[PDB]
JSON list of C-alpha atoms in Angstrom, two decimals:
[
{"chain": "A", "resi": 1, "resn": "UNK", "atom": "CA", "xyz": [-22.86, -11.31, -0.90]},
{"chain": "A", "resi": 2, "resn": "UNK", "atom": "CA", "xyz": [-21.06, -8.73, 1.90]},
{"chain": "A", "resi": 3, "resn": "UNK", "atom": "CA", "xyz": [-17.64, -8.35, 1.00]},
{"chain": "A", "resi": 4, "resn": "UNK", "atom": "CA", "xyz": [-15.61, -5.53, 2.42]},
{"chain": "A", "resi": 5, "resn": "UNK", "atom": "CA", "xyz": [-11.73, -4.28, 1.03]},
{"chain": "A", "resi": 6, "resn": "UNK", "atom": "CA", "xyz": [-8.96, -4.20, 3.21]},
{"chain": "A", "resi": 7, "resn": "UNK", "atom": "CA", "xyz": [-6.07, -2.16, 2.12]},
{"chain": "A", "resi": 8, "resn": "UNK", "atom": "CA", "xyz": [-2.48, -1.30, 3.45]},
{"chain": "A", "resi": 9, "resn": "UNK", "atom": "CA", "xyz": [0.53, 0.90, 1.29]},
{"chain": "A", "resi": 10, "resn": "UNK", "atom": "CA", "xyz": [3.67, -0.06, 0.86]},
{"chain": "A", "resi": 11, "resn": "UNK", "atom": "CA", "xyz": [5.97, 2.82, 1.31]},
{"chain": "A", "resi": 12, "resn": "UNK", "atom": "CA", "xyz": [9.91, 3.08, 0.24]},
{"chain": "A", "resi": 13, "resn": "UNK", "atom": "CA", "xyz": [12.24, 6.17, 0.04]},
{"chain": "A", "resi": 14, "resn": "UNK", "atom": "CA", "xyz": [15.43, 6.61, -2.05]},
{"chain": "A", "resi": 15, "resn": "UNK", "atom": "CA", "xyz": [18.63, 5.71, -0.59]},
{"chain": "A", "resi": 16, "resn": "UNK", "atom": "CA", "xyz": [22.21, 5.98, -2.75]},
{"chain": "A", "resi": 17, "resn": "UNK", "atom": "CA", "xyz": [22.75, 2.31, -1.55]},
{"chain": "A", "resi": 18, "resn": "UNK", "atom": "CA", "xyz": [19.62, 0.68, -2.02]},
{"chain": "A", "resi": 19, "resn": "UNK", "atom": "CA", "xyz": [17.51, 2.64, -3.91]},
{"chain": "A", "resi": 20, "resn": "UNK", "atom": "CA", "xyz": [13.81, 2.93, -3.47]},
{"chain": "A", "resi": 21, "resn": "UNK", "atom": "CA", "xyz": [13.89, 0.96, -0.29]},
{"chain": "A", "resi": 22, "resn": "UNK", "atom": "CA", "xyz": [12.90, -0.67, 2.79]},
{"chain": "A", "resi": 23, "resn": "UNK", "atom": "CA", "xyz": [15.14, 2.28, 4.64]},
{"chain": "A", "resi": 24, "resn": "UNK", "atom": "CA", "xyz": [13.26, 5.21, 5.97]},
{"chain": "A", "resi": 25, "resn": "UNK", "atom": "CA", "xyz": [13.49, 8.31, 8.02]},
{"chain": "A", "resi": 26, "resn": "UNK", "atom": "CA", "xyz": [12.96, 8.61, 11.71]},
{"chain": "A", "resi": 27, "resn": "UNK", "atom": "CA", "xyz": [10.37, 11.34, 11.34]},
{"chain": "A", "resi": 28, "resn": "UNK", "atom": "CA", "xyz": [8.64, 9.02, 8.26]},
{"chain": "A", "resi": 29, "resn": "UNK", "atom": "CA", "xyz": [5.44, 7.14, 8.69]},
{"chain": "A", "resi": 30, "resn": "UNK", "atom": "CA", "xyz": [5.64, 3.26, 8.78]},
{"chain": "A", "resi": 31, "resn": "UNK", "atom": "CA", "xyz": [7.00, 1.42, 5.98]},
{"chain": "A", "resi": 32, "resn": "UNK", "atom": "CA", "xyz": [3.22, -0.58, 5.73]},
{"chain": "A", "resi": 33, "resn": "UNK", "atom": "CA", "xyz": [0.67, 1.96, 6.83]},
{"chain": "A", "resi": 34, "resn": "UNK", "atom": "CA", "xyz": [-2.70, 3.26, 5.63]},
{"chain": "A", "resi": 35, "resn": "UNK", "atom": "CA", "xyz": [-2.85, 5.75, 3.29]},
{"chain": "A", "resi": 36, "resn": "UNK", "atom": "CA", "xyz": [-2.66, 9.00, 5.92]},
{"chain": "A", "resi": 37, "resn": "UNK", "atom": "CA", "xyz": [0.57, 7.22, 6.90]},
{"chain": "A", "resi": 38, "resn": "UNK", "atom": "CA", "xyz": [-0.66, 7.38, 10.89]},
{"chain": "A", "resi": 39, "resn": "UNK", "atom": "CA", "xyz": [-2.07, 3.45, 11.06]},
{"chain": "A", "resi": 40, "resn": "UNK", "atom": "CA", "xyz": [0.41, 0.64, 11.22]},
{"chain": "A", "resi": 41, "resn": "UNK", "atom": "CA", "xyz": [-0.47, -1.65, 8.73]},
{"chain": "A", "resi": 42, "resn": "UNK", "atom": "CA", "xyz": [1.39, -5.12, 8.59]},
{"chain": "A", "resi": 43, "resn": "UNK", "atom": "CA", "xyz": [-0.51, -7.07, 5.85]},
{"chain": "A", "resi": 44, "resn": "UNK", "atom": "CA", "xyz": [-0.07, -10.48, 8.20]},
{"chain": "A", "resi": 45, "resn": "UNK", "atom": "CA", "xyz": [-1.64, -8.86, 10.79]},
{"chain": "A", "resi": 46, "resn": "UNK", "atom": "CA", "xyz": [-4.87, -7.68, 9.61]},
{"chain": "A", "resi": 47, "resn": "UNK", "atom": "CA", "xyz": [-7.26, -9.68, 11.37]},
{"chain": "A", "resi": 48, "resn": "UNK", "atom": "CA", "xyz": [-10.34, -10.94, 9.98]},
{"chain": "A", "resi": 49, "resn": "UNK", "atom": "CA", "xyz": [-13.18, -9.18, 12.46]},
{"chain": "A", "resi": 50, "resn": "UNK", "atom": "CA", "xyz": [-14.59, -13.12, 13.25]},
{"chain": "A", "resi": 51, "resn": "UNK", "atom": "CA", "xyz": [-14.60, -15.90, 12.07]},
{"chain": "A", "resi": 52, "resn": "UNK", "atom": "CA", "xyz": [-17.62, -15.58, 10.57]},
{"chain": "A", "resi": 53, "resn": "UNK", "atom": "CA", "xyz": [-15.96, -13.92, 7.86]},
{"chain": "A", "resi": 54, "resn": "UNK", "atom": "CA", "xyz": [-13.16, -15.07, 5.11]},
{"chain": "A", "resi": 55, "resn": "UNK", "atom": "CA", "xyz": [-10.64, -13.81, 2.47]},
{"chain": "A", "resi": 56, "resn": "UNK", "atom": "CA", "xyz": [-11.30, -14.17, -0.96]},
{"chain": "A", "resi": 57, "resn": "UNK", "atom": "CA", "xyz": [-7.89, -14.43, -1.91]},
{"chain": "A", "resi": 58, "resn": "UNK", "atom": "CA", "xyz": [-4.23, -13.48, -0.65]},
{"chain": "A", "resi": 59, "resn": "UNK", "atom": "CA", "xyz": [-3.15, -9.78, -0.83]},
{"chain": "A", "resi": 60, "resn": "UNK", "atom": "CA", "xyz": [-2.60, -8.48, -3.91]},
{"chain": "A", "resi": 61, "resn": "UNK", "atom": "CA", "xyz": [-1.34, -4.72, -5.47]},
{"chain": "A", "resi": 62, "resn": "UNK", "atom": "CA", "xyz": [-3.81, -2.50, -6.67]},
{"chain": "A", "resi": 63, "resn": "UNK", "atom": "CA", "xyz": [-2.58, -1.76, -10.03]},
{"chain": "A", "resi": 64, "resn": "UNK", "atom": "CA", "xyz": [-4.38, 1.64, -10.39]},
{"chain": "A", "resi": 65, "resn": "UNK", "atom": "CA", "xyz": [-4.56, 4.99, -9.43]},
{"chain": "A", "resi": 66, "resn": "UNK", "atom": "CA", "xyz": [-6.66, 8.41, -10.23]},
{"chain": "A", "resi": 67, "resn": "UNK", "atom": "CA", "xyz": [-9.00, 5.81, -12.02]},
{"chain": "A", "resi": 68, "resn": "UNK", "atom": "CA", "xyz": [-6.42, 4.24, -14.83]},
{"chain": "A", "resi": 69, "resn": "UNK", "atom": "CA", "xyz": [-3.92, 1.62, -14.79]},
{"chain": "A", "resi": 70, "resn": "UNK", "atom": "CA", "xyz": [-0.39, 2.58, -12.63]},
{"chain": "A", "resi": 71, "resn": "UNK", "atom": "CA", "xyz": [2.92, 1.07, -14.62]},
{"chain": "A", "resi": 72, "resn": "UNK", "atom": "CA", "xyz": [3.75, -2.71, -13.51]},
{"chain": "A", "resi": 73, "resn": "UNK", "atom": "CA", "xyz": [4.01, -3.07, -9.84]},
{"chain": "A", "resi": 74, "resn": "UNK", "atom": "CA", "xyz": [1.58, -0.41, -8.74]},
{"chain": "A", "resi": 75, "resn": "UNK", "atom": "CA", "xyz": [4.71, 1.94, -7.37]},
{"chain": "A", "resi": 76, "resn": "UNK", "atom": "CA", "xyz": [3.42, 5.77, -7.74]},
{"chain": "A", "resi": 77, "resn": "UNK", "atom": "CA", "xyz": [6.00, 8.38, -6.86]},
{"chain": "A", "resi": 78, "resn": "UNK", "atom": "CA", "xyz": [6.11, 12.13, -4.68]},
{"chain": "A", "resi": 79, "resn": "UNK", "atom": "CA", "xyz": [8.71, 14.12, -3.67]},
{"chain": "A", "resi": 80, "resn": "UNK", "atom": "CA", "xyz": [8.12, 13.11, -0.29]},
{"chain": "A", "resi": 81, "resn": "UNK", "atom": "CA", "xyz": [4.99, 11.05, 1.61]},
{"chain": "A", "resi": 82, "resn": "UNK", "atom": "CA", "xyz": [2.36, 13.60, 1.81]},
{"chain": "A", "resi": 83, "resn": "UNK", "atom": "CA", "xyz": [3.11, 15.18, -1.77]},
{"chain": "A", "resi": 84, "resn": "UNK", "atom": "CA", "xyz": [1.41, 14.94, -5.17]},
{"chain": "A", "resi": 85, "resn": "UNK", "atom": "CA", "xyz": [1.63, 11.41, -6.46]},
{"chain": "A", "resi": 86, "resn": "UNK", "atom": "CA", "xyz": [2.17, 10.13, -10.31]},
{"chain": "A", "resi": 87, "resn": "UNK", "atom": "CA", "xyz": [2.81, 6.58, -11.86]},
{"chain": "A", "resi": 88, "resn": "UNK", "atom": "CA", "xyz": [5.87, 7.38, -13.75]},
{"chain": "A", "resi": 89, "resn": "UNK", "atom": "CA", "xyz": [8.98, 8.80, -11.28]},
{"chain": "A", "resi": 90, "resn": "UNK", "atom": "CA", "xyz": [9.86, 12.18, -11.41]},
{"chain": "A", "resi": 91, "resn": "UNK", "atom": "CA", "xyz": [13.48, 13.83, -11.55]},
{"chain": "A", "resi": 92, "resn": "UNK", "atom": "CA", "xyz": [12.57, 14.85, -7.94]},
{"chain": "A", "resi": 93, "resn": "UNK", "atom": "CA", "xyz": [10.47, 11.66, -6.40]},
{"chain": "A", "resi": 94, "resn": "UNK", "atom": "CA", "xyz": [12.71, 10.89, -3.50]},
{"chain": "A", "resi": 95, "resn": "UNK", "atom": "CA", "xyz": [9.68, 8.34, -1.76]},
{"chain": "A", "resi": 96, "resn": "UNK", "atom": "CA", "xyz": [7.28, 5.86, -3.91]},
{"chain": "A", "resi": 97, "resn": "UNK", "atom": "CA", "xyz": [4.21, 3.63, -2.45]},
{"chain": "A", "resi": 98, "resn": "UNK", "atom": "CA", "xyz": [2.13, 1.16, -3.48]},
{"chain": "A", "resi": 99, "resn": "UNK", "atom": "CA", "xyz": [-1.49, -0.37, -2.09]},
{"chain": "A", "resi": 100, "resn": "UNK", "atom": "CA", "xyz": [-2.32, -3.58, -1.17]},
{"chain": "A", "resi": 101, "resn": "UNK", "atom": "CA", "xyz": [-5.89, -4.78, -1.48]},
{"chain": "A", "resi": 102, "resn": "UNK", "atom": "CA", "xyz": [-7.43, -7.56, -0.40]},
{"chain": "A", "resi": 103, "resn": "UNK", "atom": "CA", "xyz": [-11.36, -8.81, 0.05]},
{"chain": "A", "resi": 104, "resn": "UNK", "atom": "CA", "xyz": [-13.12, -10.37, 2.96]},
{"chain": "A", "resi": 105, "resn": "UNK", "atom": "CA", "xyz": [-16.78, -11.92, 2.44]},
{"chain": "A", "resi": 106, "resn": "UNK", "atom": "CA", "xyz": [-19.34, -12.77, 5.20]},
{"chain": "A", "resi": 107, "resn": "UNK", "atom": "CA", "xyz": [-20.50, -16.19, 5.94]}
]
């Protein structure tokens, strides 16, 4: 079976109003992006390449990261976007991300 994984991150910064949020800064990357940051990444509008091909499922959160399990919700935490990440938040993590993942399979 060919099957290929899509993925797109989910990416929030800390604001005193809404916490870990949907509100970002001008000179941030896009709040659904790959994992550089520089590709817009809208999980609705990843395209299958044909229609020879299908999903497997819906999208989904990769619950891991550096090969173990993140905490619930797949959220890992930096000082800013293209810092060191961890799964548990930091006295200093001001952004957080997460990845989406989800499989296509040729036909």
């Amino acid at each position: 079976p060919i099957r290929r994984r899509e993925e797109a991150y989910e990416n929030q910064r800390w604001n005193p109003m809404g916490g870990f949020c949907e509100k970002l800064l001008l000179s941030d990357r896009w709040g659904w992006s790959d994992v550089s940051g520089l590709q817009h990444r809208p999980l609705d509008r990843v395209a299958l390449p044909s229609p020879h091909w299908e999903w497997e499922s819906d999208w989904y959160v990769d619950e891991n990261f550096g090969g173990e399990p993140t905490e619930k919700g797949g959220w890992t935490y930096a000082i800013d976007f293209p810092a060191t990440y961890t799964k548990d938040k930091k006295w200093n993590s001001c952004v957080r991300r997460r990845k989406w993942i989800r499989y296509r399979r040729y036909k």
